[PDB]
């Protein structure tokens, strides 16, 4: 015979609990990747982005190493 139902209250805050939030952790990860890719894409034209980030990527990075010949540059 069972006298009482068997349960606990899990910690919660603002209607979030750890079981639920843990299911969304990977989704935040992907959104963060999406935001990272998008941000980097937006500033791909910025020279510093090319100099510091994009030109350092292996294989692909030579796409961003481009020199104007000194003969063709007024400045």
């Amino acid at each position: 015979y069972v006298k009482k139902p068997s349960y606990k209250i899990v910690p919660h805050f603002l209607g979030f609990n750890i079981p639920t939030v843990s299911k969304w952790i990977p989704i935040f990860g992907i959104w963060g990747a999406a935001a990272g890719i998008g941000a980097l894409f937006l500033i791909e034209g910025v020279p510093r982005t090319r100099q510091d980030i994009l030109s350092k990527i292996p294989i692909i990075g030579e796409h961003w190493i481009r020199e104007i010949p000194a003969s063709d540059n007024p400045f």
Partner: protein, 438 residues
């Protein structure tokens, strides 16, 4: 621990299945048949339902009046129903009136007159039934739901059949239907309550031994449905209550996801404003709906057939300016079966179901219906121990995986009846089947 369901066969292949209860004084015996409207084609659609009327219209021995008297004298009653995949004919009686009832059932099934005069008489009665179902809104909604979900397929047909067929059904096609379909290998004689199994097997050998066997005996509960995402709108501004059903393709009786679908259905659950406890239920949808007065009721369902099913929800509402909110919040709760459910909801639903599946069987007719349904869909009665084990095997991962393949971003079949101006078009409803934030 309930008594064991005993099962025997005859030579023709008729199954006898019984569950005795020495605490009751009544018994329900009857014949469950693995046959229904789905076995008709387009030309004889309505035959199975037509037969159910004629079964009680007189046999080769007893006339219509004699039949009436014989049952009256027994003291209990007889009942029948035809569905898409199943026909049932049963008799509730006293303990010692069971041999009479088996004999009457055997008579009306095997030896019915189907006299042209009676065909012609019922042809009007059934024609009048076409114009009076119109009132049973839940049935109107579910019949349109099957018609659209399984558009132009046998499961999509109604049980009554078209008006045209009712006028052209002959005794020939009635006889042909019951000769092809009501065979011994598709039939189960079921007894529940104050029945002895060995007594029932003897009565089966006496009355149902000269039943035809089919040429190719497949196992009981043997069947391709192609679900159509679609909508039927039956707007009627004069009705005060809107009735809405939304469903996706669900699971068959023998699916491996059968229990996962039941658990998911229990997470959403039911609600009825007229019941006192419903404002305190644990279900999230129940809380949203009750707090905001969005609906008078909702009922989640998971209907199974041999080779498909429909899983969804039926809603009723007087709140005609917030139908959009009601539908929006319902589908956002479905989204959470894919994105958010954890062990918290899953374990709660399993608790509720472990009892629910046993609670349902609270009378001899319910027990008989359970034995008959299980024997004609699965080929066996599944013991409560096995059912408890299959429920326990459902994890939160199973629910999420099932919802992601069955609900998430899937087409729905949608039926709306009544003041449904506020129900948005198909796209806006179907766009709620996914969440852009996930």
């Amino acid at each position: 621990v309930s008594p064991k369901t005993r099962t025997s066969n005859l030579k023709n292949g008729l199954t006898i299945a019984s569950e005795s209860n020495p605490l009751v004084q009544t018994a329900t015996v009857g014949v469950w048949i693995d046959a229904g409207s789905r076995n008709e084609n387009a030309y004889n659609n309505g035959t199975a339902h037509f037969f159910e009327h004629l079964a009680f219209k007189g046999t080769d021995k007893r006339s219509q009046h004699q039949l009436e008297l014989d049952i009256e004298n027994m003291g209990g009653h007889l009942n029948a129903y035809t569905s898409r995949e199943s026909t049932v004919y049963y008799a509730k009686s006293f303990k010692d009136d069971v041999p009479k009832s088996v004999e009457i059932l055997a008579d009306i099934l095997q030896h019915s007159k189907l006299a042209e005069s009676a065909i012609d008489r019922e042809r009007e009665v059934i024609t009048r039934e076409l114009e009076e179902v119109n009132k049973q809104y839940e049935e109107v909604v579910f019949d349109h739901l099957h018609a659209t979900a399984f558009m132009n397929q046998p499961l999509g047909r109604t049980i009554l059949g078209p008006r045209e067929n009712i006028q052209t059904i002959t005794n020939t096609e009635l006889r042909k239907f019951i000769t092809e379909n009501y065979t011994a290998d598709r039939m189960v004689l079921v007894g529940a309550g104050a029945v002895d199994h060995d007594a029932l097997v003897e009565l089966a050998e006496k009355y149902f031994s000269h039943l035809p066997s089919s040429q190719s005996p497949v196992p009981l509960g043997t069947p391709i449905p192609n679900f159509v995402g679609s909508e039927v709108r039956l707007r009627d501004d004069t009705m005060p209550v809107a009735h809405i059903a939304i469903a996706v393709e669900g699971v068959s009786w023998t699916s491996e996801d059968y229990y996962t679908a039941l658990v998911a259905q229990a997470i959403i659950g039911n609600y009825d404003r007229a019941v006192g406890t419903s404002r305190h239920q644990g279900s999230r949808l129940s809380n949203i709906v009750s707090e905001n007065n969005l609906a008078n009721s909702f009922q989640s369902f998971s209907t199974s057939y041999s080779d498909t099913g429909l899983w969804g929800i039926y809603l009723t509402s007087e709140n005609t300016t917030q139908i959009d909110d009601l539908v929006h919040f319902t589908l956002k709760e479905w989204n959470r079966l894919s994105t958010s459910v954890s062990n918290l909801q899953v374990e709660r639903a399993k608790s509720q179901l472990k009892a629910g599946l046993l609670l349902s069987l609270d009378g001899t007719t319910y027990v008989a219906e359970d034995i008959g349904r299980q024997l004609t869909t699965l080929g066996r009665r599944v013991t409560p121990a096995e059912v408890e084990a299959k429920l326990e095997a459902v994890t939160e991962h199973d629910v999420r995986a099932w919802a992601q393949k069955t609900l998430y971003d899937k087409d729905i079949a949608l039926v709306g009846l009544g003041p449904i101006e506020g129900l948005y078009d198909y796209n806006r409803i179907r766009n709620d089947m996914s969440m852009m934030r996930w």
